[PDB]
Design a protein around this ligand. Structure first.
Ligand SMILES: Cc1nn(C)c2sc(C(=O)O)cc12
Ligand SMILES: Cc1nn(C)c2sc(C(=O)O)cc12
Ligand SMILES: Cc1nn(C)c2sc(C(=O)O)cc12
Lengths: 275, 287
């Protein structure tokens, strides 16, 4: 028997088999199943993922809330109900890992770069759980923010390399009024830190406009903006091609930055068109 | 989609071709059965095919791919037997409707990039000296499952450790396929079917009955306990000219981090000249 599913309401499932059976039943009814993976503590950046999913005609939206051990609940659910989301998938760690940590996904060597410097197993955790959610839910499209750009690229590698049939959709970063990318970590910044933190996005938009004068100009403009900020310890500032290989001499790229303010690590990135 | 002719063998090399045919067949009600192979087909493989065929309304996909990722060496990949003409002929005789024969480039356009890391079972038994072998196997099997999206996938008990690892892949990644293990098909004297038996000369083929003889002796000895079962098998292997044993191990049925209770699996690997042969059997201890 298919688990209970009430159309137009928020249906919450905590068992992977339940959400798997309801998703498969809905697919058979002529719905397109959209998956929005999250770790809860939802903010407007997560809601942009939800809204992008909802606009696909025929969509049913599944939002998973799972804190990976390997990479309020009531508040989150209320936010999803207010968005018209019909399915939330809220499994326990033991439901996700009933045999513990066993077969995992090994990322390619991109996972050791950039964010993988301080956290060399983070992406193996992310890709393992993303793979599992994709198999449980079997969505037609899966939605991820561009803010975690290296994650997004590695996800696309997973999908290509394991021949997954899902479409991966990147959704542009949602930003505070001064450009700071949204994050639950922003609230930990004191006022001097929060003022300094706008240097990340300001550096990146300066670089994207400087880029008519070429790659070096784009990088030097971003470095000058970051150098104008106090208490911003830059971990990296890298211009790469769109798939995070070496930047080509012109054309399309991506500029990524990460920095520590006090004990809080912030990331941002932007599209760059060289010349 | 490309062309699909029922009651005929349709051969697709392009992953996208077999994926589109598979999805179209599933959409019309047929259940899709996958039998992954490395070619060089013998009656062991045909038993998997026959098991697949008997599932009602099934369409059978047999894949043939010598997977370079599960080979290290040392020339093992180049030496693997390739008999493509006979393979497709056998499949036509068995009434299989789909053969999937992808190229290396189609499977690995980016080389080795994201891969499957098996659990600790992969570092034991066959994996002890070949620590990357089962990562190769699981990577290729995951890709085939995603390409074909079968309802059921068929593997031999012959390669028992592989089968157990594929059940772990399926469970651990929440794959929506059922894994069917098919019992080992044997020559009249007991020798397990294998695409390596072709490398046994007459003397080695005669000597090689010792593996199956040892294992069935142990299974019967096992009414007297584990030591009795192991010592019976060791005796038979010891009496065999030119069999060099690499391991003889009695484990729990899942080969995992748990001791033997009542039900076990006894596994052997041995070398006859340069030919390495495997076999295994169910063991029931005592009562
Ligand atoms: C910032 C931000 N913008 N968006 C679309 C997203 S999705 C997300 C997330 O952590 O999933 C963060 C953000
Ligand atoms: C403000 C702001 N900061 N960043 C990194 C970007 S990207 C962007 C945009 O319109 O693409 C606006 C902004
Ligand atoms: C003959 C023979 N050798 N072996 C290992 C086995 S397992 C078996 C069986 O019928 O279950 C028969 C045989």
């Amino acid at each position: 028997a298919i688990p209970a599913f009430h159309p137009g309401e928020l249906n919450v499932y905590s068992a992977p088999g339940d959400v798997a059976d309801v998703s498969r039943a809905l697919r058979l009814t002529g719905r397109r199943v959209m998956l929005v993976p999250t770790m809860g503590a939802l903010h407007e950046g997560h809601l942009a993922l939800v809204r992008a999913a909802k606009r696909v005609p025929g969509s049913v939206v599944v939002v998973s809330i799972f804190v990976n051990p390997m990479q309020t609940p009531d508040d989150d659910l209320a936010q999803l109900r207010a968005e018209g989301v019909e399915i939330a998938f809220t499994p326990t760690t033991a439901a996700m890992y009933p045999d513990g940590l066993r077969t995992t996904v090994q990322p390619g060597p991109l996972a050791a770069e950039l964010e993988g410097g301080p956290r060399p197993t983070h992406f193996a955790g992310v890709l393992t759980v993303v793979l599992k959610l994709l198999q449980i839910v079997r969505p037609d499209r899966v939605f991820f923010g561009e803010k975690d750009y290296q994650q997004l690229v590695l996800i696309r590698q997973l999908v290509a390399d394991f021949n997954l049939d899902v479409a991966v959709v990147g959704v542009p970063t949602v930003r505070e009024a001064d450009g700071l990318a949204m994050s639950s970590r922003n609230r930990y910044l004191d006022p001097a830190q929060r003022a300094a933190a706008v240097a990340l996005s300001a550096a990146l938009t300066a670089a994207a406009h400087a880029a008519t004068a070429g790659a070096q100009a784009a990088l030097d403009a971003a470095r000058a903006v970051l150098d104008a900020a106090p208490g911003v310890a830059v971990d990296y500032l890298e211009l790469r091609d769109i798939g995070l290989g070496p930047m080509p001499l012109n054309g399309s790229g991506r500029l990524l930055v990460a920095a520590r303010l006090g004990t809080t690590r912030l990331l941002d990135n932007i599209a760059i068109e060289i010349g």
